[PDB]
Ligand SMILES: CCCCCCCC/C=C\CCCCCCCC(=O)OC[C@@H](COP(=O)(O)OCC[N+](C)(C)C)OC(=O)CCCCCCC/C=C/CCCCCCCC
Ligand SMILES: CCCCCCCC/C=C\CCCCCCCC(=O)O[C@H](COC(=O)CCCCCCC/C=C/CCCCCCCC)COP(=O)(O)OCC[N+](C)(C)C
């Protein structure tokens with residue numbers, strides 16, 4: 040279920056880059072940034088909730104009193120909603136007070152007219168950036184804590200390498216964003232968004248598709264048993 | 279091979295990091311003007327090291 | 328009066344049963360089968 | 373003083389175990405076997421010394437061939453679909469001593485191997501572990517033991533922990 | 548349903564209505580024994596048990612004693628009466644070989660039990676040694692009910708047969724057949740001249756003592772599960788049966804046609820009973836709930 044939700048949010052993430060191409064308008068400059076912010080926070084939340092469940096399942100060897108309802112199937116979506124609630128409310132408050140707009144800039148250059156979008160309030164954008172970075176940083180710890188889980192349940196190698204690409208790509212573009220202006224800042228934004236989404240999709244899913252469709256082995260339920268048999272040490276038999 | 283605390287894996291990790299950093303450096307260098315060329319060229323060195 | 332006292336008695340009984348069930352839920356129960364005259368006594372020691 | 377269910381209690385590494393020895397009931401099993409629906413696992417004991425030289429108060433009823441029948445009946449009950457079995461094969465010293473004189477071919481029709489202890493024990497384990505047909509739901513843990521072996525409690529502990537872990541993955545839908 | 552009783556935590560195996568048609572008694576596969584109160588759902592007593600393998604329970608006609616039993620092969624009597632304010636074991640009756648599968652109070656000093664040893668017995672609670680032993684069954688006795696005059700009783704065992712004993716002479720006098728599998732329940736007609744059975748063949752039959760014959764069979768083509776409990780209502784017009792498929796059925800004794808159905812349990816029904824005045828029906832199931840229908 041969380042995989043389906045993550046795939047839907049990632050579909051939203053690629054489609055969110057199509058608002059940065061074409062002539063700016065009043066509503067496009069209002070829908071540019073919140074779309075990507077929410078569509079990426081959703082994926083981060085899905086990853087966090089999934090990892091937190093397997094650990095809680097695996098760290099409950101003693102007969103368990105209540106965590107049974109703590110790892111409920113329906114509460115995962117509630118946790119995801121609680122994680123994205125901050126982004127939702129910040130975007131709503133930002134659009135309420137000082138929404139973006141369209142601007143014809145005649146002061147950057149004498150003989151050229153530039154069409155750009157205003158931001159209304161930079162604080163309301165810094166808050167989104169900080170929240171996304173904080174969740175991405177928490178993903179590092181949640182991947183670190185999950186490194187000792189058995190096979191088919193451990194993904195600590197792929198969570199970190201998808202956040203590293205995101206951080207590197209979005210840090211290396213700071214000088215160009217600060218100094219350069221024109222029609223290429225939008226191209227930089229599109230490239231960064233597209234690269235982050237591609238890295239996430241690849242590093243999360245391309246490893247499994249290969250075992251599922253090709254090398255259809257490690258493919259039955261009579262192997263995943265032996266694989267899950269390592270955390271507690273006795274699964275002994277001859278078969 | 280776990281010869282020395284899984285040494286053959288961290289080498290692969292570092293090489294991938296190096297390649298990613300410079301591939302990402304290409305477009306950022308290609309779209310920067312003025313005094314920030316040094317800014318975009320120092321960051322890649324620091325990250326790789 | 329009598330209904331009230333029965334209410335507190337029932338509440339105390341329910342509390343005791345809840346605690347007993349909570350304590351008993353944390354034990355592993357094993358059924359020891361086996362063929363006749365085959366062992367099942369050394370395992371006990 | 374009591375007869376019928378017998379109970380033993382012990383602790384190991386912050387766990388509590390309860391063992392029921394209902395083998396002294398001496399009545400029809402089918403009328404009370406369903407009272408144990410909910411046990412974590414079933415511990416089964418088989419003596420390797422019966423492979424031959426001892427039948428049971430009868431003329432053509434091998435003790436091992438009756439233990440196999442009881443294992444087949446128990447492992448495939450309607451009430452024991454999800455409960456795993458811990459199988460103990462005891463008295464291996466006598467088996468090793470008697471292999472050199474009495475081969476294994478007197479018990480089962482086809483091969484054993486080298487008439488060597490290592491090869492006969494593996495074949496007996498394979499034959500005894502093939503009587504289950506619920507392979508998609510339950511699992512079997514086998515551990516050769518003797519009168520001197522003293523590591524049985526850690527085998528039981530680890531098997532119980534593994535059973536508990538896989539049971540929870542199933543509820544959550546993961547496995 | 549009119550009242551629902553909660554508080555158990557495991558499967559429920561027995562139940563017996565009180566002689567005042569107000570209080571109950573229930574036994575679950577724990578060490579617990581709760582005395583209920585269907586008028587206002589407040590519990591009265593909760594008795595822990597040494598062995599958590601209870602199979603039957605009974606409530607004394609004097610309202611002062613109860614009984615238990617199970618795979619421990621022992622019947623125990625509890626002093627529910629004034630005993631300084633609590634309950635403690637009065638006597639443990641030993642001597643049976645197999646498990647104990649039914650027990651009924653005759654008086655405050657005599658109790659009849661049936662066991663899986665293919666043997667019933669009549670005990671003496673003051674001494675603890677059985678005074679009469681009823682033998683003749685070749686299978687495990689599963690059910691037992693007493694006549695209104697408490698001078699005759701019947702039994703059913705895992706061999707298809709029913710016997711009519713008398714508590715004084717200690718000898719069987721009549722044997723009734725007709726079933727083709729094990730028999731699980733039995734109870735007398737209110738007049739004491741007939742009884743009904745319930746087997747694993749999904750059929751219920753009626754027998755009469757004077758004619759020594761089988762009168763009617765109550766069955767259907769949509770039932771394959773066996774019966775676990777059988778009870779007559781007052782005047783004998785309505786026969787109540789509890790089945791494995793979560794359901795309870797109401798029959799017509801005279802014409803053998805279904806007249807109702809009871810469906811409120813999510814698990815197998817293991818016990819049911821009707822009050823002395825025929826005012827209510829109680830049902831127990833393999834979950835931890837009880838219900839009262841009216
Ligand atoms: C261009 C500018 C960009 C600036 C960023 C670049 C900075 C330099 C980058 C990196 C230095 C460290 C690289 C970390 C690589 C992770 C290695 C890895 O992948 O190992 C995988 C797993 C464990 O191994 P396993 O699962 O495969 O097998 C285990 C199976 N068993 C247990 C049986 C053996 O390791 C784990 O658990 C993961 C534990 C946590 C990982 C630590 C990551 C720390 C990241 C710091 C960067 C912060 C952003 C920079 C902010 C600056 C703002 C101005
Ligand atoms: C994970 C990473 C995801 C990112 C995707 C990477 C692929 C992107 C492909 C193309 C993006 C180009 C952006 C177009 C913007 C228009 C700018 C333009 O093309 O104009 C032209 C500029 O360009 C160029 O001559 C080329 C720019 C030089 C780049 C270095 C390339 C050689 C690299 C060494 C790095 C290490 C390589 C390692 C090999 C890896 C192989 C495995 C002319 O304009 P100018 O003279 O006024 O510029 C002046 C800019 N100043 C002031 C900085 C000079």
Ligand SMILES: C[C@@H](NCCCc1cccc(C(F)(F)F)c1)c1cccc2ccccc12
Pocket residue numbers: 071072073075076167168171172209210212213216228
């Ligand atoms: C679409 C994109 N806005 C990028 C312009 C600000 C910026 C440009 C260049 C570098 C940096 C940063 F690396 F300093 F963050 C920020 C965006 C919208 C909403 C949330 C976001 C969260 C993280 C990253 C991008 C987010």
